[model samples]
Target: TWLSDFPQAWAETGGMGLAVRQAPLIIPLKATSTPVSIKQYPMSQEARLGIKPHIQRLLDQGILVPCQSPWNTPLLPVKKPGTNDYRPVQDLREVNKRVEDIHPTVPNPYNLLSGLPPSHQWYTVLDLKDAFFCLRLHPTSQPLFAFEWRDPEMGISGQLTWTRLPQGFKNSPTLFDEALHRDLADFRIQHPDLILLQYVDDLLLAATSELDCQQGTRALLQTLGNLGYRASAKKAQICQKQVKYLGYLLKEGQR
Candidate 1:
């Protein structure tokens, strides 16, 4: 019955989201920094196979679009250690240096969790999937995050850029954290009895009672969905007396 009440919180129901609540982000380039272009090496066969579906998914979502850029980074489909699958990693070291700094508001895990009152023990933890893609990138800024790409089967090859805030760039975490914080500001004001902690894309909801935790989570998910955010149902831990968050297992007000 609780699942029936909050369809927007789950990946299966809400799918991918584009937050309608936050303003689009601009990639602020430093005054003296010039554009840089780097043509990358050929993607390895194993790497291509691993990354192909991701590329297609982004394209389908319109997160990745064909474009030409004065600034272009390498798309390195590199393999993981002791693994054959390749993860798509864009080399953005040059671009990161060219950009101005935004003060990081993301707090350390201990600093973040210190707000949890001992009386608030019931918990629901949520992890967001493709978290950065929910925020939009201004068109002016989109060109700065471009990378070269080719479709072997589709026979199309050109540069592709993200229309949304992308991974592999410095400041993305800070940017995303701030954006979500802004989005959740009203939610905080609406729920005084509940303690909701967010660290980037992870959310932990705490309440004094199991019923309160359940209702808070349902309302949080409903609001998140209405505001265009998606939570991974597979990774969700709802209304638990004990749970894992930020790599630690939390139980009875102790970590």
Candidate 2:
């Protein structure tokens, strides 16, 4: 697990830091107990093209909202215990059974895709080598994030603790993807000029002009960097016309 190998937790407080209740999630300390275990879902060609009505059922039910940092939002735990190592169970079954009504369906994703014009198109793909490695949770929030592994393969990687929120958790991608989306929305960014596309640490961008592309790229990089996100330029590529970004085969099609 990479959490064991993750750098030290609880970085030194430079000057007197503000007092907070939640302890910062220091990587070194978490690594000691929480090993970073990740599982990659196989993306088969058939699965990508094939329609899954079941998936739409969940989507239609308004069960999953696009969110970032699952537990980052201040949530009162349903269960409380004496030990600081407590994590609330994600009790979806009970909640779903109890609730009869759901919120309105999210906007169709195709609405975001249909605006692209055929001519004057280009795409850029950027990957952050170690995305989450860039930010450390505040000292107060650390303990709430504690996670464990039962299997030997996932357990006891040296002496480090395992993190509950590994990089590849089912909800992780949505959390990260929405965070980036929120920022774009907050900034009132425009598409093609300030295009935004994301899949966890990897981003696929589209623009109508070279200047727009470069500016959009810089804005995204700088904004995320300012927020302590590590954007790896070495993993970025900019080009005109052909763009195979964020899974979809993108091209400027004829009218």
Candidate 3:
């Protein structure tokens, strides 16, 4: 029986010498994207060491880039093979290594501007279209990435496609956020009726009143729609007093 094999497998293979037990997990049924769930917030900590300056260096001069979609956080660099009279380029992190456990308190963008009273109770959310595709790499930084994948239409050998923009590369968020810092400057937006928010591509706008919320919703939908970012009315929701945005609970009594 399936149940009878459990103890036998554990007894025979659970030991660490040469055998190991493996049982992959499987969940039953499928579910839609509705009835959103909330994830736990990590404990906050402050940066204790003087590694901020070093991180600043990695962000500025480093050629390592972030990974592509669904696998969106690993940093990768183009690895070159050894050739005649040429040494192969390796990931620099293997040689010059300085790792420090430093947790810095990053600024929370969901904060409300000071001296303003909360009035409305409605909410609207917007998501950007192909946000990473909009950015392109710098021209002069060509030597950073060297690969052999050739496109007949786009030249081959010695010539490479190195992008300065950080899509599908390491250190993309830092670079993208740094460049787009103007949008988050001091609670200023064309539509004050909406409480602007952003989490990577996803955005949420909360308001204190129905009219303000509806107006903000229309403005956001029109702006994104005009830009050709298809905003699905079925997925887009409004008039929610208690909603979850970027895994955080947003309401009067919850965090």
Best by TM-score: 1
In model 1, which residue pairs have backbone atoms overlapping below 3 Å?
Answer: none
- The superposed Cα distance between candidate 1 and the true structure at residue 118, in angstroms, equals 0.6
- Which parts of model 3 are misplaced by more than 4 Å? 1-118, 142-146, 150-164, 168-170, 181-187, 224-235
The TM-score measured for candidate 1 stands at: 0.95
Model 1 residue 182 CA deviation (Å) reads: 1.2
| TM-score of every candidate relative to the true structure | 0.95, 0.44, 0.44
Report the candidate with higher TM-score, 1 versus 2: 1
TM-score (C-alpha, index-matched) for candidate 3: 0.44
Model 2 residue 203 lDDT score: 66
Candidate 1 segments whose C-alpha is farther than 4 A from its true place: none
Backbone clashes under 3 angstroms, per model: 0, 27, 12
lDDT of 1 by residue, 165-237 (tens): 9898899899889888888999899999999998999999999999999889888988888988888887889
Per-residue lDDT of model 3, residues 34-114, tens digit only: 111122122112221122232233334332232221111112222224422222122323111211222222235445322
> In candidate 1, what residue range of length 10 has the lowest lDDT sum?
1-10
Distance from true position, residue 111, model 1, in Å?
A: 0.9
